[PDB]
Design a protein around this nucleic acid. Structure first.
Ligand SMILES: Nc1nc2c(ncn2[C@H]2C[C@H](O)[C@@H](COP(=O)(O)OP(=O)(O)OP(=O)(O)O)O2)c(=O)[nH]1
Ligand SMILES: [Ca+2]
Ligand SMILES: [Ca+2]
Ligand SMILES: [Ca+2]
Ligand SMILES: [Ca+2]
Ligand SMILES: [Ca+2]
Length: 901
DNA sequence: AAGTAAGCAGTCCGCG
DNA sequence: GCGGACTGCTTAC
C-alpha cells in the first residue's frame, strides 16, 4: 500500500514523524530535514523556480531548520522578501508525500477517553490536579475495546469492584443498562491505589499510543488533568510520556475575555469532540453538556443518578463506573452519526496538514495552495503583516412587511466560489484596474464596458483571462467534491420522502428492511417492494435513509464551508494571500449579480404578464431572490387545480422551463458585460411555497430583512410527503428563545401559513391559558455569559450591566458561601428567568448554568418567584405581535356586529 | 482563530 | 413611551 503520515512535528532540527509504512505497519522516524527557502534573483540567473508573478528565484538549501529560521530573520533585518513555506513540517509533508494521499482509517489509532475525579470542594481545576483520578475509560479504535481503569481505594472512599453483570441489567432490575452491544468489548481493570492505576495507564498508552485523541472536553479537562496529576505524583518526565516524543508545551488559549491552559502533546493530534461538534455541526445549542448533546443527537435519555456527582462514587460506585463507560460510548455514537472524525481525516490528508489543523481554514488553504504551486516549481510569497480594515459585503433587499401567498425562491450554487471561478480572482491573476462607475450604473447596464481584454468585477478590478489562477483552480477541486456529496445527501432525502409516503399504508407482515444504497434514488423495483413492507421495516429504512442524509450533509456542508472560507480568507489579515482588492472584488460582484438579476426577472415577468413596473421580486439576500407567484397561479385560476400537488407541479415546471432559462440568459449577458472568463452564475430554484389548496392559510410572510416564514412543498427537488416550514431569523430559530416558546411560536406560524387567522386565535388562547404549567427550564431564556467580572461591583450590577449578567450576579449572591453549588463559567451559557417584584433574591432576574437543573437550595424559591407575566410578554407575545402585524392578521379576535346576538 | 449585513434585547437618557 | 447611541448576542448569507 501507499504510505501515509499519521502525525508530524518539528523538534529543534528534527522532524518527528509517525506514519504507516508500505506494509500497513505503524512506524516512527526522526529526520534531519534540510528545508529550502527562496530569494528573488537576477533575470540572467538560469533557474527553474519562479514566484507566483513569474519573477525568477534562487533556492537556498539550509544545513538545518534553525539555519532557515535565522535566515528569515536576517532577511527581515536587510528588508528583503524571504520566499517559500516557512512552516517546515508542511514542506516536509509535501516532499515526503508527493502524491494524492490514500489513507486507510483502519490503521489509524483513534482513542476516545473520559476520566472521573471525585472532588468535595467544587470543580477540580486541571492546572492544580489536587484530587485523585478515580476512573478512566479509554476506547481504542484498533482493538475496538473499552479499557476501564477503576480506582478502588482513595482518600475519598474505598469501594467494591464494578460488576459487569449488574452493568448490563435493565434500570428496572437495579442495573445500569450499559448497551448490550458494548458489554463484550469492555476490559475491566481495578486498582488498589492511584499510583498503580496511573503507571499502568502510561504503559498502556505507550503500547497503544493515540494518533487521533478525542472525547468530550478532553482538551480543556481530561488531558490537562491527567498530565498535571501524573506531573504532581511522579514528576514532569513521567507526565511527558503522554507524548510519543516526550515533548509537551503548556499552551495558552486566550482572546479578550480571559485565558486558559492547554497541554500540547507533540506527536498526537487532539480533536476534542466538543470543538469538532461546534465547528462542523451547524447548530447553536443552549448547552454543550454531553447529556444535552447526546439527547439532541441520539434521542437517548440523560444518565440519571441521585445526589451530587461529588458523592456518586461513594454512594453508588457501580453506577459511577457504568456512567463513565456510557459517556465514552455516547461520543462514539454521535460520531457514527455525524462522521466528524472521517471528515477531519479526509480534509487533513487532502491539504497535507497536521489533522488538528482542520480547525483553521487559513492553514488548510495555505497548505493546499502551497502544494499546488510547488507542483509547478512555483514559489509562494512571504506572509506579511496588515492592519485590520473593514470592507463591504453582500446586498440585502428591504422587503415590504406583508403576507406573501405564493412564493418561488432561487439562489446561486456556491455563490462566492462561483464568482471567484467566473471572474478568475487570484493573487497572481490581477491585471490592473478600471475607472469605476456607481454600482447602479452596472446593475442597469448603462455604465461603459469595463474592459475588452480582461475579466472584471464592478469594484474596479481586472483579471487575466489566458489561464486560471491557483485560487480558482483549487477552489474548483473542493467545489466538485462538495457537489458529489450534496448529490448523495439530496438523493437520501428524496428516498426518505418515498418511505414516509409508504408509511401511510404499512402492510401486516413479518419482513426485513431492504438492503439498498440510500445515496442513490430508489429504482422502480425498490419502490414496489417498499409499498409491500411492514411499518417496522419501513421505519428502520427511514432511520437508515436519514442517517445517510446526515452523512451526506456533514460531507457537503463542511466542504461548502471550506470553499466559502477561501473567499473569506482573502479578507483575513492572517492569510498569506490577504488582499482587500480580491476580497472586495468578490463581494461587489455579488451585489451586482443579485440586483442585475432582480431587474431581469422583473423585466421577464412583467413581459409574460403584460404589466409595467410591477415588482415580482419581493426580497433577496446576497445571492437569492424571492418571486411572488400569485399572478402566475391566478393566470390559470385556482379552481383549475385538482389538489395542492397539482399547482406545486405547475410552478416547478414554470420555474424550470421558463424562469431558469430567462435567468440564465440574463446572467450570460452580465458575464459578457464584465468580460468574465467563464459563465458560472447558476441560479437554481430553491423553494416552492404556498398555502394548502382550498385553505385559509396565508402561505408566507416577511417582517423584515433576514426574518420570514414560508410553507414549502418542494425544496431543491425534494417533494415532501408533508409541507415543511422554512423559517429564517424569527425567534423559533434562535438558541436564546425558550424551548417551549420556540415550539409554541412555531405552531402559531404553522397555523398562520397553513390554516389561517381563526386557527391562530384558537391556539394563542389555549397557550396563554396553560403556559404557567410549563417546566421552568422549558420557559427559561438562554444567553452566552461573557465578561461577568467587568460588570461585577461587590456582587452587584455595575453600570450598563446586561440583563443576563445581572441574573448571574443574583445567582452568585444566592449561592454565596457554598463550595459545592455549581459555578457559572465565564464564556459558557446560562438559563435566565425574570423574578417578580419583592422576591428574596433582591433583583429582577436570576441566571444559572444552562443544561442543568438549578441547585436545590434555591430552586423552590425561583419557582415560587418566577415572573410568568414578564416571560410571556417578552418571549412570546412581543414576537407574535411582530409576526401577526407583518402578516396583517390578529392573534386575538376583534369585536364584531355579530356579538350582539 | 481572524468573511459582512443585520436583526432584537437591554441600558442609558433625551424628548419641553 | 419611543428613539438614538451603545453593548451584547445571535442569526442569514
Ligand atoms: N465566509 C463565509 N461566507 C459565507 C458563509 N455562509 C455564506 N457565505 C457567503 C458565501 C456564499 O457563497 C454566499 C451565499 O451563501 P449560501 O448560504 O447561499 O451558500 P452558497 O451559495 O455558497 O452554497 P449553496 O450552493 O447555496 O448551498 O454567502 C460562511 O459561513 N462563511
Ligand atoms: Ca463524568
Ligand atoms: Ca446560494
Ligand atoms: Ca441550489
Ligand atoms: Ca403498503
Ligand atoms: Ca442563498
Amino acid at each position: 500500500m501507499k504510505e501515509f503520515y499519521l502525525t508530524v512535528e518539528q523538534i529543534g532540527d528534527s522532524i518527528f514523524e509517525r506514519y504507516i509504512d508500505s506494509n500497513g505497519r505503524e512506524r516512527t522516524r526522526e529526520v534531519e530535514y534540510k528545508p529550502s527557502l527562496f530569494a528573488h534573483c537576477p533575470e540572467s540567473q538560469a533557474t527553474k523556480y519562479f514566484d507566483i508573478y513569474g519573477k525568477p528565484c534562487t533556492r537556498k538549501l539550509f544545513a538545518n531548520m534553525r539555519d532557515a529560521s535565522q535566515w528569515i530573520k536576517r532577511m527581515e533585518d536587510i528588508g528583503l522578501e524571504a520566499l517559500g513555506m516557512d512552516d517546515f513540517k508542511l514542506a516536509y509533508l509535501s516532499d515526503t508525500y508527493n502524491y494524492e494521499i490514500k489513507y486507510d482509517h483502519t490503521k489509524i489509532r483513534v482513542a476516545n477517553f473520559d476520566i472521573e475525579v471525585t472532588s468535595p470542594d467544587g470543580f477540580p481545576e486541571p492546572s492544580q490536579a489536587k484530587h485523585p483520578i478515580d476512573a478512566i475509560t479509554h476506547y481504542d479504535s484498533i482493538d475496538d475495546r473499552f479499557y476501564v481503569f477503576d480506582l478502588l481505594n482513595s482518600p475519598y472512599g474505598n469501594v467494591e469492584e464494578w460488576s459487569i453483570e449488574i452493568a448490563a441489567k435493565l434500570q428496572e432490575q437495579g442495573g445500569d443498562e450499559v448497551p448490550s452491544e458494548i458489554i463484550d468489548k469492555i476490559i475491566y481493570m481495578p486498582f488498589d491505589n492511584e499510583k498503580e492505576l496511573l503507571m499502568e495507564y502510561l504503559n498502556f498508552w505507550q503500547q497503544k499510543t493515540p494518533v487521533i485523541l478525542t472525547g468530550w472536553n478532553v482538551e480543556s479537562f481530561a488531558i490537562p488533568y491527567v498530565y498535571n496529576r501524573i506531573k504532581n505524583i511522579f514528576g514532569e518526565s513521567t507526565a511527558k510520556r503522554l507524548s510519543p516524543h516526550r515533548k509537551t508545551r503548556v499552551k495558552v488559549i486566550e482572546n479578550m475575555y480571559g485565558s486558559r491552559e492547554i497541554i500540547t502533546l507533540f506527536g498526537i493530534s487532539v480533536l476534542d469532540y466538543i470543538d469538532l461538534y461546534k465547528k462542523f455541526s451547524f447548530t447553536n445549542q443552549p448547552s454543550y453538556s454531553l447529556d444535552y448533546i447526546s439527547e439532541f443527537e441520539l434521542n437517548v435519555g440523560k444518565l440519571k443518578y441521585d445526589g451530587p456527582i461529588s458523592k456518586l462514587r461513594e454512594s453508588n460506585h457501580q453506577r459511577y463506573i457504568s456512567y463513565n463507560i456510557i459517556a465514552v460510548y455516547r461520543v462514539l455514537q454521535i460520531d457514527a452519526k455525524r462522521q466528524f472524525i472521517n471528515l477531519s481525516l479526509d480534509m487533513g490528508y487532502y491539504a497535507k496538514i497536521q489533522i488538528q489543523s482542520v480547525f483553521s481554514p487559513i492553514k488548510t488553504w495555505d497548505a493546499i495552495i502551497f502544494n499546488s504551486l510547488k507542483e509547478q516549481n512555483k514559489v509562494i510569497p512571504q506572509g506579511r503583516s496588515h492592519p485590520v480594515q473593514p470592507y463591504p459585503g453582500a446586498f440585502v433587499k428591504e422587503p415590504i412587511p406583508n403576507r406573501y401567498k405564493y412564493v418561488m425562491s432561487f439562489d446561486l450554487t456556491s455563490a462566492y466560489p462561483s464568482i471567484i471561478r467566473q471572474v478568475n480572482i487570484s493573487p497572481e491573476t490581477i491585471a490592473g484596474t478600471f475607472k469605476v462607475a456607481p454600482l447602479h450604473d452596472y446593475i442597469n447596464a448603462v455604465a461603459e464596458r469595463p474592459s475588452d481584454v480582461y475579466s472584471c468585477s464592478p469594484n474596479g478590478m481586472m483579471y487575466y483571462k489566458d489561464r486560471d489562477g491557483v485560487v480558482p483552480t483549487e477552489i474548483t477541486k473542493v467545489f466538485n467534491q462538495r457537489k458529489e456529496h450534496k448529490g448523495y445527501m439530496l438523493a437520501a432525502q428524496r428516498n426518505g420522502e418515498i418511505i414516509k409516503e409508504a408509511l401511510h399504508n404499512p402492510n401486516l407482515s413479518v419482513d426485513e428492511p431492504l438492503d439498498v444504497d440510500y445515496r442513490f434514488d430508489f429504482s422502480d423495483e425498490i419502490k414496489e417492494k417498499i409499498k409491500k413492507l411492514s411499518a417496522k421495516s419501513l421505519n428502520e429504512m427511514l432511520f437508515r435513509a436519514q442517517r445517510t442524509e446526515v452523512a451526506g450533509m456533514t460531507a457537503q456542508i463542511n466542504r461548502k464551508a471550506l470553499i466559502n472560507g477561501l473567499a473569506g480568507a482573502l479578507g483575513n489579515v492572517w492569510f498569506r494571500y490577504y488582499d482587500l482588492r480580491n476580497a472586495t472584488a468578490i463581494t461587489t460582484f455579488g451585489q451586482m449579480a443579485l440586483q442585475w438579476i432582480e431587474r431581469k426577472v422583473n423585466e421577464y415577468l412583467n413581459e409574460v404578464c403584460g404589466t409595467e413596473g410591477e415588482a415580482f421580486v419581493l426580497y433577496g439576500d446576497t445571492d437569492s431572490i424571492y418571486v411572488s407567484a400569485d399572478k402566475i397561479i391566478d393566470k390559470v385560476g385556482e379552481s383549475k387545480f385538482r389538489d395542492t400537488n397539482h399547482w406545486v407541479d405547475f410552478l416547478d415546471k414554470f420555474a424550470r422551463e421558463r424562469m431558469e432559462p430567462a435567468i440564465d440568459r440574463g446572467f450570460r449577458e452580465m458575464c459578457e458585460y464584465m468580460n468574465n472568463k467563464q459563465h458560472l452564475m447558476f441560479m437554481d430554484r430553491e423553494a416552492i411555497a404556498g398555502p394548502p389548496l382550498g385553505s385559509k392559510g396565508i402561505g408566507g410572510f416577511w417582517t423584515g430583512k433576514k426574518r420570514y416564514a414560508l410553507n414549502v412543498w418542494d425544496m431543491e427537488g425534494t417533494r415532501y410527503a408533508e409541507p415543511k416550514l422554512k423559517i429564517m431569523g424569527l425567534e423559533t430559530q434562535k438558541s436564546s428563545t425558550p424551548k417551549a416558546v420556540q415550539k409554541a411560536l412555531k405552531e402559531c406560524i404553522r397555523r398562520m401559513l397553513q390554516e389561517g387567522e381563526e386557527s391562530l386565535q384558537e391556539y394563542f388562547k389555549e397557550f396563554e391559558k396553560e403556559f404557567r404549567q410549563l417546566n421552568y427550564i422549558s420557559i427559561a431564556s438562554v444567553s452566552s455569559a461573557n465578561n461577568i467580572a467587568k460588570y461585577d461591583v461587590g456582587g452587584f450590577p455595575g453600570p450598563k450591566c446586561p440583563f443576563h449578567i445581572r441574573g448571574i450576579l443574583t445567582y452568585n449572591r444566592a449561592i454565596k458561601g457554598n463550595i459545592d453549588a455549581p459555578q457559572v463559567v465565564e464564556g459558557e451559557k446560562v438559563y435566565v428567568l425574570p423574578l417578580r417584584e419583592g422576591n428574596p433574591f433582591g433583583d429582577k432576574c436570576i441566571a444559572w448554568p444552562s443544561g442543568t437543573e438549578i441547585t436545590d437550595l434555591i430552586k423552590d424559591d425561583v419557582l415560587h418567584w418566577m415572573d410568568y407575566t414578564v416571560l410571556l410578554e417578552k418571549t412570546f407575545i412581543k414576537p407574535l405581535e411582530g409576526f401577526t402585524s407583518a402578516a396583517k392578521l390578529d392573534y386575538e379576535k376583534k369585536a364584531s356586529l355579530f356579538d350582539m346576538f
